[PDB]
Amino acid sequence: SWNDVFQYETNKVTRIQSVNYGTIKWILHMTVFSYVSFALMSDKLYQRKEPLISSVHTKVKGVAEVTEKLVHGIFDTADYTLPLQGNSFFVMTNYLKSEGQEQKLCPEYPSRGKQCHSDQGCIKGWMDPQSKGIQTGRCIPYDQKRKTCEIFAWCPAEEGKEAPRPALLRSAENFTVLIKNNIDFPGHNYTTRNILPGMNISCTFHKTWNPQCPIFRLGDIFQEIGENFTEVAVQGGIMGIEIYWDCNLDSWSHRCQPKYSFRRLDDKYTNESLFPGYNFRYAKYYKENGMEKRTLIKAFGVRFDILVFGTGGKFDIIQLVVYIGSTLSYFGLATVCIDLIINTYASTCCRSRVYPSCKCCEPCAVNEYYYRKKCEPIVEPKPTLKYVSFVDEPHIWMVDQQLLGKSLQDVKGQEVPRPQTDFLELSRLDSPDWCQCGNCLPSQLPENRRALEELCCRRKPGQCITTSELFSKIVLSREALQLLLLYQEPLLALEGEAINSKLRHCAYRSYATWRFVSQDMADFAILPSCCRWKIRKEFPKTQGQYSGFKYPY
Template identity: 45%
Template sequence: MQLLEISFSKEVSAMVSCGCLKDPFHYDSPKSIRFRSVGCVCAKWFIYVVIAIYICYTLIADKRYQEKEEVTSSVRTSVKGVAHAVSRIWDTAEYAIPMQSRDSFFVMTNVIQTENQIQSRCPEAPFAKAICSTDKSCENGSAYVHSNGVQTGRCVQYNETLKTCEVTAWCPVPMEETPPVPAVLRSSEDFTVLIKNNVHFPKFNYTVQNISPNFNSSCTFNKITSPLCPIFRLGDILQEAKENFSEVAVKGGVIAIEIKWDCNLDSWSYYCSPEYGFRRLDGKTRTQYPGFSYRFARYYKRENGKEQRTLFRAYGIRFDILVFGTGGKFRSVELFTFIGSTITYFGLAFTAIEILFSLYNCSGCWKIQFCDNIIRKKYETVLEPKQVMLVSYVDKPHVILIKRPLKTSLQDAEGSIFENHPVKFSDPCSFFTKEPNENHDTEESQLSCLMQSTRSPKCPKWCCCGQCNLTQKFHEQLCCRSTDGPCITTTYWFKKLVLSRETLNKALLYEDPFLDLQGDNTSNQLRHAAYKQYVHWRFGSFELEDRAVIPSCCRGVIRSTYPKADGNYTGFKIE
């Protein structure tokens, strides 16, 4: 198994505590860490100011305090203008052809006419499958996609150099010609169109139209001088769409007339007027076949009763009217919802600072004592107890964490810093009471003798203090020092805090005031109390104190001072 190390924020752990399920009527308040840092405070307030400016701008510019609704629209158009071309007068009934699509109208700008067509037999227009040399090349009754009629099975002369299959069709068949240049109805540039647009906002029960009550019927739209006039000159529309009318008129095109309604229906700042925009939809540079055309015919009877027609291939401009927009009106619910949702943005300041601390914690390039202290206070590390051992050297300022399993002596095993040495006994003298000098001297004499009698004659290689005992178990091969020097057992405070019977008696009675310290088990109780005193002294009091390993030298002195009757000691439980 691997070591499980999960860092939890104290704030989060308090909020998800299981206690809240047991007692639904108690309140959990998150824990915060307060520290002085000019950089963090400046970063926090900078982010606060940016967020506040953003919220105010969005609230005012986008009117986030309003309830919004999409516009519902209806459009009617009326085209006016007369042109003279091809020896005839073209009026509205001739060139303004109703479109089947919604909110669109078509104006013819160019035309190819095939006059006096009657149903009979005639040569097919030349295309790949209609060109022939003999009757065998023509199939009776066949018709192709590009055919103008049904083949009769005969191959006839089309002109002096070419033969084509004969067809039953409206004859003569139309020729595949390019549209005339310049356009036949190029004067349609001066035609005008009146656009009547009614919009409705059902949620607010409000209706408005683009024609005002004081409408001047002689006006013409101009983006600067008359931006609200609903009468548009076709040439001006093409110019606003950045197109040349004479060029577009040859093959036609598709132009969008955009009407945008952004209505503020609040009484104190009412505004609801259309904004017009224009652009080309068929994109002459981005479409393989730009332009717009279709065919239609006009029929009439001849004197002999036969039906005759004139076929028109009409090129022109299709105008699509696109209406969109929203209406908004103040609603307190929308305002409170917006404010409530944006308050959470202020948490970005804390998130940004926390990310910086996390990046610092993950980086090993530099170390700052101030940041280390904050991270140590902020996070608690939860460990799997059975997989770790904690070691404290008298010549190092840190508690060392070593992971299992061991492949060498605990003294030589590599570990990581767990935490700084905690100061548990801020006033060590408080553990003792004034005793007569003779008692003090007697106790000192006894401890000195014990110290002299516990020196190890054969010191192991891993021992640095000269007081450790030889052992075969890796996890017991630990010295009180990491480098050569005097043993901690020779110090005054080890004697007073760990070995002193008076101190141990007080520690035991502190935990159990009625404990019998005169029984047969007294030595075992004092030995265990000495172990605990050493752990609290060198490691501090924390949830993993049972994983703290007592050095061999200290363990030997404690056992010789307070021995076990049978001499069989359990030792550190490695499990």
């Protein structure tokens, strides 16, 4: 039990002294190592990455003068900008005014060919989001030239009027926005900001000269991406200020700096029915003479959306371990490829065609030696398994099918090469129809099992193997068999029928080992009737019938 615990299994290997294969192995190992290292360091797969949480604080500075009796106006942050001071801020670039609005009946603004021509056309009680009123069903003259439906809404109405061109607040392109970005990686417990001590304040952002200046001129934002602020100012738009944080929190590779990029977020070619641009209608309410009045301003502008994103990486042992474990199996590529080469070039097909056709692959025949020193083929031992050898042939035949009452001599199997004998050890001092030697005899086994023993020493007519002197020296010589038995059992009693049986079995084994060198084939070999019966004649049984070949399993 404890001995079972205290065991270590190590694979048997074959140390090959080959320049080609060693060079290939080291080249592939180096390639795998290089790619693994490159992937680890480039993608920082050894680091735990966490997304950031951002806080944005914007301050827009800039004033515009608008001339529109002539009225001279001044526009500051309490005028053209909203209380928006975070991820988004709005800069007004144009506007439409409608002073003194009261909820009453009035003609809807004639625009986009909405002028009415017939009273029946207008509907009663119909909600009109385009005009923002309820039509009363009666057409009325908005102007002496054209007529429009009557809506109970805020009056006077100015819906559908185009934004003035050129934009009144074009000067917004000269306005400067300061962006303060605070990010944190709570898992990594790291916080930083885009404005650090020792940074100049009289700077404006540029891709090259001042890439870290958080002060942006809107016109520069637009022209860095090929957008015409003057055109966008008319109907408005949405622009994006991307702030990317590719941040490394490792001490030896610490750099957490923002990268500023810009992107228009509103489609230039939005259909006129999809409300192009960016605008919003905001109203100031007041009391006049005793009635509640409203002043409506339709403000066109650019909404700047500050989009902050990024990841913060810090070394994590678990991630590195996982990556290494993932990539470890790639170091078996050399083994796989070289074993594939050995297996393929060990095939008896290359010599036939490939080598004569291509003579450059001639020295690759050495892989047969490697294969035979690397692989030990074996077959499943099954009852039908049988091996036969014919002295007129230089190979052994394996039969792995049932004998359906037909002689094993006539049964056909497949050819296999007889194993090489141990030279170091060998260097020492009315006959049956199926019989082609004349010495074979009918089987005494039951009828259903006579086919197994119906085998001859040779396939073609000739002399029996029993005529060879080695048959008598090895198989029939009682002295040699006695020596073998004593070698196994030194104090054996060479008397009785037991010794005759043991000698018979040793003779069978001797023939099997002589003609089927491998013990694997010798165990499942089948002796010819001639040799079997000569053996039995030499070492015969008493008051018993021979059983024959047993299944080793």
